[PDB]
Design a protein around this ligand. Structure first.
Ligand code: PJI
Ligand code: CL
Ligand code: MG
Length: 293
């Protein structure tokens, strides 16, 4: 079956005065592989991919601030806040060069960090990643009405904060196969207290859709432009129908991105890791063996 356990010893590091939790497994030397989750997940989303990689490479998987087992400061939980904390996490572990494996808002962090630190990125594997969505028509039809509602202060907070819709509704709708209760309970655990749900609401309000917020559109356009001019090895996983990255978009990127291999993981929405962890993990391990690391 698909594993439901999380058999990783907890590690913590102090970051801007807060403790951040992270997985750290695999060999001690070499180039580490840094796995960045997004909304509304945690390092749990990588639990069945890490074991394919850990035999050959160090795997580091932090929980974003306010998420997973990381601390919950008083924060806006803006993308800008996550940039400060992730920048500081990477320096607090003393990382030098890395390979990135990134998803959803973790991909916006990873691509933005790579743009600003290009000499330190030896490869990027990515899936269901943040790109500009120029109009609402380019958001999947089945999810337009809900994300339009999320992007309000009254109805959106009632849904996501009061009723925990991103965890109880949106997350399962991002997986083709049924999630089981152990898996849901791991995703629920950081958010049992409603007042701890601000990241889950601020994130969809940061998504670059139909030109807003314009600062996030600008930041994401910048790292997409960087990506298209970078020789860094790239590995793109995509599913059908997808959510952020539909098949036609994956095919465009497979053509336009330098040094990019694309892999079709079969049926998939947003949390591709939950529908096909073994192909994602085995293809990352293979690709790592071809990098000059
Ligand atoms: C970085 C991107 C991450 C993507 C994650 C995966 O995304 C998958 C695509 O999105 C799926 C979107 N659909 C859903 O989330 C389905 C669940 C919707 C909420 C259903 N629901 C409730 C509904 C309350 C009422 C609503 N109102 C008034 C309204 C108005 C406009 C649009 C939509 C809506 C909804 C949200 C339907 C309650 C009863 C609160 C509830 C309780 C528990 C679970 C689900 C729901
Ligand atoms: Cl989101
Ligand atoms: Mg504090």
């Amino acid at each position: 079956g698909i594993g439901t356990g999380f058999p990783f010893d907890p590690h913590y590091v102090e970051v801007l005065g807060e403790r951040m939790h992270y997985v750290d497994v695999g060999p001690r030397d070499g180039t580490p592989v840094l796995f960045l989750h997004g909304n509304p997940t945690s390092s749990y989303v990588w639990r069945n991919i890490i074991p394919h990689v850990a035999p050959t490479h160090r795997c580091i998987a932090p929980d974003l601030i306010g998420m997973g087992k990381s601390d919950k400061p008083d924060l806006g939980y803006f993308f800008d806040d996550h940039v400060r904390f992730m920048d500081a996490f990477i320096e607090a572990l003393g990382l030098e060069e890395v390979v990135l494996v990134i998803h959803d808002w973790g991909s916006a962090l990873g691509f933005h960090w790579a743009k600003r630190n290009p000499e330190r990125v030896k490869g990027i594997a990515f899936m269901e990643f943040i790109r500009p969505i120029p109009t609402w028509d380019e958001w999947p039809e089945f999810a337009r009405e809900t994300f339009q509602a999320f992007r309000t202060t009254d109805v959106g907070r009632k849904l996501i904060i009061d009723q925990n819709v991103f965890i109880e509704g949106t997350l399962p709708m991002g997986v083709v196969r049924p999630l089981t209760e152990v898996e849901m309970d791991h995703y629920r655990e950081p958010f049992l207290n409603p007042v701890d749900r601000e990241p889950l609401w601020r994130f969809p309000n940061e998504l670059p859709i139909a030109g807003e917020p314009a600062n996030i559109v600008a930041l994401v356009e910048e790292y997409m432009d960087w990506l298209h001019q970078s020789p860094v090895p790239k590995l793109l996983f995509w599913g059908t129908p997808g959510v952020l990255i539909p098949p036609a978009e994956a095919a465009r990127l497979a053509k336009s991105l330098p040094n990019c291999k694309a892999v079709d993981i079969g049926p998939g929405l947003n949390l591709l890791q939950e529908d096909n962890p073994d192909l994602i993990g085995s293809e990352i391990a293979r690709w790592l063996s071809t990098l000059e690391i």
